[PDB]
Write a protein that binds this ligand. Structure first.
Ligand SMILES: Nc1ncnc2c1ncn2[C@@H]1O[C@H](COP(=O)(O)OP(=O)(O)OP(O)(O)=S)[C@@H](O)[C@H]1O
Ligand SMILES: Nc1ncnc2c1ncn2[C@@H]1O[C@H](COP(=O)(O)OP(=O)(O)O)[C@@H](O)[C@H]1O
Ligand SMILES: [Mg+2]
Ligand SMILES: [Zn+2]
Lengths: 691, 371, 283, 55
DNA sequence: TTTTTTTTTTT
């Protein structure tokens, strides 16, 4: 019988049960097929040996299936079963690979998903020395320090090395008196025969919103040994699995006044819970019309703003960070700066880009650089990373840009055109790297953006800073009846399906793929296609109170050139996406202009550039204004928010004569204006507007 | 560590405190901000560093709330509808079936306030609370509504707040001039015993899922109105300090009272010029009750009559139905539904949002804090 | 080199192991693991590898290559020692000389590299040999990055009686093979990788013909021809006649400039005019 | 700008902006001079010796 | 060598 009347701890420590368990584990290691007739621990051990990993995973459920008695002995006395399993897996591997002795000569078996997921606040004294599975964020980690594992001293009066004592993680090992000269004294270690092992200590704490319902969040310690160290960084969400081991502390006893012991989790398996094939992508990119299909995949909820959707999509994948051969270090990062009156889903545009992107971080402007910090655990005055070095390759989401401080302002600009920070702090003089794309949103002064002044006035920002941004989108608002329903219905419906009674799969894997397998090239056929525009537009802008497109705009345009090499896999500059690059680089410049200049420059260029746009949107641009202005008339004399606005026809083609389309019936058939709640009548000429 | 309850404080004294030691399965019954009722033995404890000096310590064995709203034993409609004693449940039903209920809670909650019929209603709808939702992405919609009052001197502002804070259980009361940033939201304190920086809970936290009554909201400093907005927006409280990194929940509803700039409320300007709150904060309230002391004379008889009545018949002339203990029960019951929206009501709502924007329309009139 | 960078580049284990497809790159890992060679010693230079591993390396490699289908792994060569640290195998001198004479970057007339390679055969010039071993490395690491192109892109056309390929200038490290002498080896290794790669039974026994651009100004390419590959190929090529008769039939412009006949320079426009007549001629 | 902080200098150049279309041809030139991407390296080492040898 | 609160000199 493998169960007799003793303590489970002391049953397994007896020679008989020890040997029985030892032989029992081998038979499971060698013979265990999984639903296909595959010795899983034959291929898995192999894949472990093809990397020199000395760590074997044992899923607990199968151990319970193929073995009824061990999977019940295990979480009772795991300080010895996990030792016997080591010597079993060793003798298995040294049979499947008889030379592996030259690789670390020691195997640890981890254990995966015990069936007893638990909380971090419900650990009571019942669980002392019992295998446990938990969860929660990690909030610290010391450095990987070396700890004694098999110490060996040497006597100071005889030149003889004492016995190889083992080190237990509760009390400093104590050597006796020299069995060769009885010279009991202060021995010192012998650095040459002693064996060491890695070591790291972390402080895990409850997840933010998971269980911390109406109280404060508790925390615990954990000790990662040799193979585990650096499995997790501050901010990760992990799920430990480890003996819950206690040890006596003399300080707590002097604070609480009672005999109180400290506890710590000797981690045994750490499995992160976070976010981590082309043959479709070939034709999906070869659709030739992936632009529209991807634009309406970001900003999943927020309606409208297919304008700024374009710019932010351009920013997300990025561009090409070419190295100029003249030692000029042009940058390959697109930085955006939103702005607009409060209540227009700017912050949501930030938060969704937090999710969709990768390796992203976030901050408010109300910590930007590395700073000296007294470590929670180690109690040393180290240096900690800021908020511009954690996006050293990804994105940095700044919020409340206006609320930055003078030191913060003088520190943000340095990283734009240099992308490299120096820290001559109290810690030590260093020079680190920072290659991030900045995505921020400012606010309008006076609680509303008013486009009589230039944008450089309502933004409340230092002038050489706005130059460090590529795109300048301006969010604005207006009381517009037909969009009131459009936005209301959306919000109301989003409140109907959220309460307890291109999808997000293509584009994440796509920003992973298309980030890598493209390297856009640069020919010289576009080199003269642009200057013909600059020579004109420079005069056109300088003529009035404005500064024309300058070199820091040509750089942004040429950066956004490749911004579509990532979507199309095109990677070849063509006179097609140059129509797009110039279009965007003027889109982000006509808006940041004066009252009558934002329209004079439009009347020139928006008709000059031959916007590669819909022929239909230019139809709407007319009658939308012609009905809005008529409502404005019929309010300033009557005041009644009338139900059905009425506008006869003749007015529309009068203004359509300027763009020379005169097409109404092919637009009347088009359902691209029914949504805007309009009408027309052949015999009445009325463009009847309902709402 | 427990602190002397409020109703025992001798006048003109700072409240004492003592250490209680829960030592069993009773180990996490008491949380911060609660009003439990401990029952154990008083013991003496030495100073173990020199093992003298002794200090008193309470050694509790049982702990239970001081006044159970439902005397059965102490979370959905049925778990509570079980503890309802026969009279309790035959009364809650009677009220829920009552018609004109929405006028017998006002008349029975604020029995000594003549007028302002449009403020009591808002206060009630604040007490009942909305439906808190969590979007699938991971964000969360605010479920409870916030309310601010702004008015002339001596118009019964602090009286609404005192009424609400003495009626409601787990609702805290603070002034604005005598507070702090790290006292409202959350602090960080060095416990030299553990020689570590730990988190202290603030007024916005030990009133969680209740109501925080801020009087004189516009006397707070410029930097103390920032920490409160960072909490009123995301419903959470971040901490990033010496060795502490955390994010705490705060699902309180705020009832704030303020004063116009220069004493009186000037009715020829927008709101942003009559009050000195920040710009962001004025957006996070979404219910304002501007009170004005219209120099009338038919009221100045009514208010006079009511005050002199209250002062002549001190405990009488208050004839409210639905005694105050009963309303707590009805309010603990009816705060466990999650009403839904029918399609007709959704259409009505979008039409009303249509009919609200255009009132602010140009030409005919003008209003304050644009819709 | 290191023991790892020389398995990934010998065009005899870079073919069997199929070290261009992630699916079979783990074969190398398994081969290393079957010997007890740490993955950290195998990546380091061979002269610095620990002394306890290299005892019987040349036997534990021949053995563990039977278990993978590579039984011709030991060859018969010679080796020379001069002094304290000078130890050459007779196939290192060859790969160094062969790459001093065919260095890509040209610094004068055609007989400027010849002299520098004739120099590095006497023992008084061990500073050129020891230098011509860094070109021979740079070449071998820029050949398995081309045979990896024409096999993860399938640029080996089966044009009938013979395979066929061609190159693109835009691909990096394709101007290195511009010389009409350093092109034969690239093709002869391409055939060895291909024959091992393809699944057909016909293509595995067809000779290859290759063309790569020579001169952009004259607009001409260079063309070679290599016998049908096999283990015991007699090595008796036959293209010096085919190309001659094909240029004779089409009556195009060709140059049989070298001493071997199977290398020709051809106008970029007479490519197809030549190739079709050749297809018909070989038949 | 006071007549005194202005007088703290000695040389005033009111720089002028030309928008001429031949000037714009110069600008179109300068466009690709950046689009693509007596020497200073000896000018500096010349000054370093000129400043220190003339009186 | 860290927070937080409170008083007084200084840019
Ligand atoms: N409408 C009213 N009905 C009944 N009593 C009233 C009314 N308005 C004022 N009072 C009484 O007058 C006093 C009002 O003082 P408070 O309400 O405490 O001051 P307040 O309204 O906060 O104004 P300030 O700004 O703080 S002085 C109380 O004693 C009320 O009982
Ligand atoms: N068009 C819209 N679609 C959806 N939600 C919107 C829209 N406009 C405003 N919102 C709401 O407004 C909130 C965003 O406010 P925000 O832009 O953060 O204000 P501020 O810019 O003052 O910080 C969102 O939570 C969203 O619910
Ligand atoms: Mg008051
Ligand atoms: Zn001794």
């Amino acid at each position: 019988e493998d169960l007799k009347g003793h303590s489970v701890r002391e049953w397994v420590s007896m020679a008989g049960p020890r040997l029985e368990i030892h032989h029992r584990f081998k038979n499971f290691l060698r013979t265990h097929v999984d639903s296909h007739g595959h010795n899983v621990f034959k291929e898995r051990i192999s894949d472990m040996c093809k990397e020199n990993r000395e760590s074997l995973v044992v899923n607990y459920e199968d151990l319970a299936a193929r073995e009824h008695v061990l999977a019940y002995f295990l979480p009772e006395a795991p300080a010895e079963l996990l030792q016997i399993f080591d010597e079993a897996a060793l003798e298995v591997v040294l049979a499947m690979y008889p030379k592996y002795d030259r690789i670390t000569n020691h195997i640890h078996v981890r254990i995966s998903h015990l069936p007893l997921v638990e909380e971090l606040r419900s650990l009571r004294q019942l669980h002392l020395n019992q295998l446990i599975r938990t969860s929660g964020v990690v909030t610290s980690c010391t450095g990987v320090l070396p700890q004694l594992s098999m110490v060996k001293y040497n006597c100071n009066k005889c030149n003889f090395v004492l016995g190889p004592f083992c080190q237990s993680q509760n009390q400093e090992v104590k050597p006796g008196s020299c069995p060769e000269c009885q010279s009991a004294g202060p021995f010192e270690v012998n650095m040459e025969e002693t064996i060491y092992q890695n070591y790291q200590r972390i402080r895990i704490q409850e997840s933010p919103g998971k269980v911390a319902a109406g109280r404060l969040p508790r925390s615990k310690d954990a000790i990662l040994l040799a193979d585990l160290v650096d499995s997790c960084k501050p901010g990760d969400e992990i799920e430990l699995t480890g003996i819950y081991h206690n040890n006596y502390d003399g300080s707590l006893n002097t604070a609480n006044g009672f005999p109180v012991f400290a506890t710590v989790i000797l981690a045994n398996h750490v499995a992160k819970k976070d976010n981590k094939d082309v043959k479709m992508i070939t034709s999906l990119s070869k659709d030739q019309q992936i632009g529209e299909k991807i634009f309406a995949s970001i900003a999943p909820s927020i309606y409208g703003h297919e304008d700024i959707k374009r710019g932010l999509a351009l920013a997300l994948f990025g561009g090409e960070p070419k190295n100029p051969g003249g030692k000029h270090k042009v940058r390959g990062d697109i930085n955006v700066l939103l702005c607009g009156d409060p209540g227009t889903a700017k912050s949501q545009f930030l938060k969704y880009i937090e999710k969709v992107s990768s390796r992203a971080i976030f901050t408010t402007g109300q910590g930007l650089t590395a700073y000296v910090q007294r470590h929670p655990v180690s109690r040393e005055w180290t240096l900690e990373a800021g908020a511009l070095v954690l996006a050293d390759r990804g994105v940095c989401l700044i919020d409340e840009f206006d609320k930055m401080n003078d030191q913060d302002r003088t520190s943000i600009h340095e990283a734009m055109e240099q992308q490299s920070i120096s820290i001559s702090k109290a810690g030590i003089v260093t020079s680190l790297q920072a290659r991030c794309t900045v995505i921020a949103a400012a606010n309008p002064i006076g609680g509303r953006y008013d486009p009589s002044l230039t944008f450089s006035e309502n933004v409340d920002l230092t002038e050489p800073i706005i130059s460090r941004f590529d795109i300048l989108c301006v969010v604005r608002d207006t009381v517009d009846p037909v969009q009131d329903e459009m936005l209301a219905r959306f919000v109301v419906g989003s409140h109907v399906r959220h309460h307890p009674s291109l999808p997000q799969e293509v584009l994440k894997k796509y920003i992973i793929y298309a980030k890598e397998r493209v390297h856009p090239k640069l020919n010289q056929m576009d080199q003269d296609k642009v200057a013909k525009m600059y020579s004109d537009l420079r005069k056109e802008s300088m003529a009035t109170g404005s500064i024309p497109i300058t070199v820091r705009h040509i750089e942004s345009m040429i950066r956004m050139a490749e911004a579509h090499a990532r979507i199309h896999l095109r990677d070849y500059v063509i006179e097609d996406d140059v129509n797009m690059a110039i279009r965007v680089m003027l889109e982000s410049f006509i808006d940041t202009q004066k009252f009558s200049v934002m329209r004079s420059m439009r009347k020139t260029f928006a008709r000059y550039l031959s916007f590669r746009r819909d022929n239909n949107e230019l139809l709407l641009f007319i009658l939308k204004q012609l009905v809005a202005e008529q409502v404005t008339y019929q309010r300033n004399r009557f005041g009644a928010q009338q139900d059905t606005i009425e506008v006869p026809e003749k007015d529309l083609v009068d203004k359509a004569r300027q763009i020379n389309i005169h097409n109404l019936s092919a637009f009347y058939d088009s359902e691209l204006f029914r949504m805007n709640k309009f009408s027309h009548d052949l015999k009445r000429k009325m463009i009847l507007q309902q709402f | 560590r427990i602190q002397e309850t409020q109703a025992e404080l001798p006048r003109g004294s700072i409240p004492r405190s003592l250490e209680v030691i829960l030592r069993a399965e009773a180990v996490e019954s008491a949380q911060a901000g609660d009003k439990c009722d401990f029952t154990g033995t008083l013991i003496v404890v030495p100073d173990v560093s020199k093992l003298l000096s002794y200090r008193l310590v309470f050694l509790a064995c049982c702990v239970a709330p001081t006044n159970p709203r439902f005397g059965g034993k102490e979370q959905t409609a049925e778990s509570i509808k079980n503890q309802m004693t026969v009279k309790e449940w035959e009364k809650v039903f009677e009220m829920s079936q009552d018609k004109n209920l929405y006028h017998n809670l006002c008349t029975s909650l604020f029995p000594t306030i003549h007028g302002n019929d449009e403020v009591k209603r808002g206060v009630l709808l604040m007490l009942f609370g909305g439906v808190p939702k969590t979007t699938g992405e991971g964000t969360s919609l605010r479920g409870d509504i916030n309310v601010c009052i702004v008015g002339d001197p001596s118009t019964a502002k602090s009286q609404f707040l005192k009424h609400v804070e003495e009626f409601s259980p787990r609702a805290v009361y603070t002034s604005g001039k005598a507070s702090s940033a790290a006292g409202l939201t959350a602090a960080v304190v060095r416990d030299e015993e553990s020689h570590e920086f730990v988190i202290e809970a603030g007024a916005l936290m030990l009133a969680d899922n209740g109501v925080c009554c801020i009087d004189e909201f516009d006397k707070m400093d410029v930097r103390d109105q920032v920490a409160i907005h960072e909490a009123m927006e995301q419903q959470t409280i971040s901490i990033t300090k010496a060795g502490v990194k955390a994010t705490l929940n705060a699902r309180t509803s705020i009832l704030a009272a303020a004063n116009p700039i220069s004493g009186h409320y000037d009715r020829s300007k927008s709101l942003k010029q009559n009050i000195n709150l920040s710009a962001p904060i004025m957006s996070r309230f979404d219910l304002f009750f501007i009170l004005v002391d219209e120099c009338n004379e038919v009221t100045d008889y009514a208010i006079a009559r009511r005050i002199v009545d209250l002062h002549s018949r001190i405990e009488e002339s208050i004839d409210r139905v639905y005694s105050l203990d009963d309303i707590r029960r009805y309010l603990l019951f009816a705060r466990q539904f999650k009403p839904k929206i029918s399609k007709e009501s959704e259409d009505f709502i979008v039409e009303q949002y249509k009919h609200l924007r255009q009132r602010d329309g140009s030409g005919v009139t003008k209003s304050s804090w644009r819709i | 080199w290191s023991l790892h960078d020389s398995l990934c580049n010998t065009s005899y284990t870079a073919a069997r192991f199929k070290l261009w497809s992630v699916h079979g790159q783990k074969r190398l890992q398994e081969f290393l693991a079957d010997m007890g060679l740490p993955l950290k010693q195998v990546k380091q230079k061979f002269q610095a590898m620990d002394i306890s591993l290299k005892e019987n390396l040349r036997e534990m490699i021949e053995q563990s290559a039977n278990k993978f289908g590579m039984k011709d792994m030991r060859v018969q060569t010679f080796s020379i020692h001069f002094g304290f640290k000078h130890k050459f195998l007779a196939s290192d001198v060859v790969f160094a000389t062969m790459s001093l004479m065919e260095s890509p970057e040209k610094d004068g007339s055609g007989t400027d590299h010849f002299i520098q390679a004739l120099d590095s055969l006497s023992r008084s010039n061990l500073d050129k040999l020891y230098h011509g071993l860094e070109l021979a490395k740079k070449q071998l690491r820029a050949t398995q990055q081309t045979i990896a192109s024409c096999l993860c892109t399938n640029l080996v056309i089966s044009q009938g009686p013979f395979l066929y390929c061609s190159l693109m200038e835009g691909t990096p490290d394709v101007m290195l093979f511009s010389r009409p002498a350093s092109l034969s080896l690239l093709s002869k290794h391409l055939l060895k990788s291909f024959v091992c790669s393809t699944k057909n039974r016909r293509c595995k026994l067809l000779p290859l013909v290759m063309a790569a651009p020579l001169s952009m100004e004259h607009g001409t390419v260079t063309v070679v021809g290599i016998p049908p590959e096999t283990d015991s190929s007699d090595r008796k090529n036959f293209f010096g006649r085919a190309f001659e008769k094909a240029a004779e039939s089409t009556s195009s412009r060709m140059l049989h400039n070298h001493f071997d006949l199977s290398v020709i320079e051809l106008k970029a426009e007479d490519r197809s005019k030549f190739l079709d007549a050749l297809i018909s001629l070989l038949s | 700008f006071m007549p005194t902080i202005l007088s703290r200098f000695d040389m005033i150049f009111i720089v002028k902006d030309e928008h001429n279309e031949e000037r714009d041809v110069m600008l179109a030139k300068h466009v690709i001079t950046l689009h693509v991407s007596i020497d200073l390296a000896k000018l500096k080492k010349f000054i370093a010796y000129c400043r220190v040898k003339c009186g």
